């Protein structure tokens, strides 16, 4: 269950730990630097690939409904599918909403009681993707939920979790099941593209990176407690600090880590 | 470990061990294709950082340098240090000789019995790092060899790996170890210098990219000679993906392919 990016809550708590179970001061600020040199190099990741997130997004969308045409019935049907596939081509500003009450249309196809719920342009994500799921046990949703609801943007899920989640939603290819499905999806589309317009991914990066610094800093001034080698290691890890302004890049990162692991093995002995 | 690249020949054996241990025909392709979708999304991060791959091995050189006017006892050796410096900053035609020459003479300062050892360009990168370490064990050769000796650039390792192996020669911090970290650096400073200039992780990444397009057809074959079928599904699924790989080649499609194959191995085994 990787993540889009973590919640400084979350990184808050994993440093309590680490200086609760870690007696030497200089161990502690080091397992926290490496802890941050890995959010900070995934985070680079995952900002390096964003611009492309919400086209994938679109596509991945296109081909679920693409396999839904195989299950039509209705004429109505398919040309709700023709379209929610139509719109995820072009840049309509309703699309989200388009992609919502599209898919509740399909699902009135099926079951007809359901059209007379009032659509609630505000309503969170996470509610509209519990309510028109269906026939999925407490568990699912549970998951569902912590993936959906994610305190007002605190953290978000990634890619690859999303498809995990996606594909233990099935579990015999009928219609419903395909629903679910594109709930599951149009829902995870919403999520991202509020996280992707407010740019929250690099508002995290940068908390982050700030976060990282603060330590390198702080573990000069805890060694500065107690010219060597350790000396020498600080500088590259200053360097690479630094050159990490110029240049975050995911080389420097494995830099960093290497130079991390310098530290900590010295320091064991 | 991890590769820049793994050689075709690697695969190929990985591929027998798959075909022999796995019962049926769509099991083995399903496992080759998983094999072949990490292969390649990995392959592609690393085409994306190579760019970056030699300014970056320049800047650590150039580090290893400063810090070994820390310890330049005799201004002959600071002159070269500074000689090798300036190589690294204007990134010459010459610079790969210039380290070479550079990394040669300060050696030859430590002990100038090493300054007749006969060695060129054209001499493997391996061979020229085993002469001039010194004092390291039967034991480090046989590992550094194992990386350097890449078999005429059959695979490589990554960054990563170079730096681990780094890491167990900082071991005893004197003038002796920090120069064979120099030599090390240098060495795979020349084994990156080739494989960019050359564009071998292009072309594995070409070759392995087809590899994997045309084991999806196979397996889009098989099936077929064996609506709501979730097989079909996946299967026009895993070939619109595919369909797409080769006009965006990226991580997330590779990502979606993944969970896909997946997929398609769970509902199979029933």
Same mark, same amino acid.
């Given at each position: 269950?990787?993540?889009?990016?973590?919640?400084?809550?979350?990184?808050?708590?994993?440093?309590?730990?680490?200086?609760?179970?870690?007696?030497?001061?200089?161990?502690?600020? #080091?397992?926290? @630097?490496?802890? /941050?040199?890995?959010?900070?190099? $995934? *985070?680079?990741?995952? !900002?390096? &690939?964003?611009?492309?997130? #919400?086209?994938? @997004?679109?596509? /991945?969308?296109?081909?679920?409904? $693409? *396999?839904?045409?195989? !299950?039509? &019935?209705?004429?109505?049907?398919?040309?709700? @599918?023709?379209?929610?596939?139509?719109?995820?081509?072009?840049?309509?500003?309703? !699309?989200?909403?388009?992609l919502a009450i599209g898919t509740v249309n399909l699902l009135g196809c099926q079951?007809?009681?359901?059209?007379?719920?009032?659509?609630?342009?505000?309503?969170?994500?996470?509610?509209?993707?519990?309510?028109?799921?269906?026939?999925?046990?407490?568990?699912?949703?549970?998951?569902?939920?912590?993936?959906?609801?994610?305190?007002?943007?605190?953290?978000?899920?990634?890619?690859?979790?999303?498809?995990?989640?996606?594909?233990?939603?099935?579990?015999?290819?009928?219609?419903?099941?395909?629903?679910?499905?594109?709930?599951?999806?149009?829902?995870?589309?919403?999520?991202?593209?509020?996280?992707?317009?407010?740019?929250?991914?690099?508002?995290?990066?940068?908390?982050?990176?700030?976060?990282?610094?603060?330590?390198?800093?702080?573990?000069?001034?805890?060694?500065?407690?107690?010219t060597s080698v350790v000396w020498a290691k600080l500088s590259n890890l200053n360097?690479?600090?630094?050159?990490?302004?110029?240049?975050?890049?995911?080389?420097?990162?494995?830099?960093?880590?290497?130079?991390?692991?310098?530290?900590?093995?010295?320091?064991?002995?």
């Amino acid at each position: 269950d990787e993540f889009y990016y973590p919640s400084l809550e979350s990184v808050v708590h994993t440093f309590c730990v680490i200086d609760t179970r870690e007696h030497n001061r200089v161990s502690a600020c #080091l397992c926290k @630097l490496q802890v /941050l040199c890995k959010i900070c190099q $995934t *985070l680079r990741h995952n !900002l390096d &690939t964003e611009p492309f997130l #919400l086209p994938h @997004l679109r596509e /991945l969308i296109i081909r679920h409904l $693409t *396999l839904l045409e195989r !299950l039509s &019935t209705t004429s109505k049907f398919q040309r709700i @599918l023709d379209y929610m596939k139509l719109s995820l081509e072009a840049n309509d500003s309703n !699309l989200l909403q388009d992609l919502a009450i599209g898919t509740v249309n399909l699902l009135g196809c099926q079951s007809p009681e359901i059209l007379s719920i009032p659509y609630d342009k505000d309503q969170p994500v996470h509610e509209w993707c519990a309510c028109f799921l269906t026939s999925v046990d407490e568990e699912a949703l549970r998951k569902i939920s912590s993936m959906l609801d994610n305190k007002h943007f605190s953290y978000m899920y990634n890619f690859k979790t999303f498809l995990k989640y996606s594909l233990e939603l099935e579990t015999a290819f009928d219609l419903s099941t395909g629903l679910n499905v594109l709930v599951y999806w149009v829902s995870v589309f919403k999520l991202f593209s509020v996280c992707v317009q407010s740019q929250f991914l690099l508002d995290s990066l940068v908390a982050f990176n700030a976060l990282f610094k603060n330590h390198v800093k702080e573990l000069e001034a805890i060694v500065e407690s107690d010219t060597s080698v350790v000396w020498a290691k600080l500088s590259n890890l200053n360097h690479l600090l630094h050159r990490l302004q110029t240049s975050n890049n995911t080389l420097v990162f494995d830099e960093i880590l290497i130079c991390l692991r310098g530290l900590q093995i010295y320091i064991k002995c």
